[PDB]
């Protein structure tokens, strides 16, 4: 099963949140595919 990305806290940067969005989207796509 595909890894779940950990939610970034303590003042995460927009690019990090963007990375979280891409990894979370990736996770969703792969989770559906699985």
Element (H, E) at 5: none
Classify 18 as helix, strand or coil.
Answer: helix
Rounded distance between C-alpha atoms, residue 9 and residue 16, angstroms: 10
Element (H, E) at 8: none
Here the tokens at position 32 are: 């559906």
The number of CA neighbours under 13 Å toward the Cβ of 30 is 11
Contact criterion met (CB below 8 Å) for 31 and 2 = yes
The dihedrals phi and psi of 29, each to the nearest 5 degrees, come to -60, -50
Here the tokens at position 6 are: 């950990």
Technique employed here was: NMR
For the chain, the helix, strand and coil percentages under 3-state DSSP, each to the nearest 5: 60, 0, 40
């Amino acid at each position: 099963p595909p890894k779940k990305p950990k939610k970034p806290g303590a003042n995460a940067t927009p690019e990090k949140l963007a990375a979280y969005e891409k990894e979370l989207a990736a996770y969703e796509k792969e989770l559906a595919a699985y």
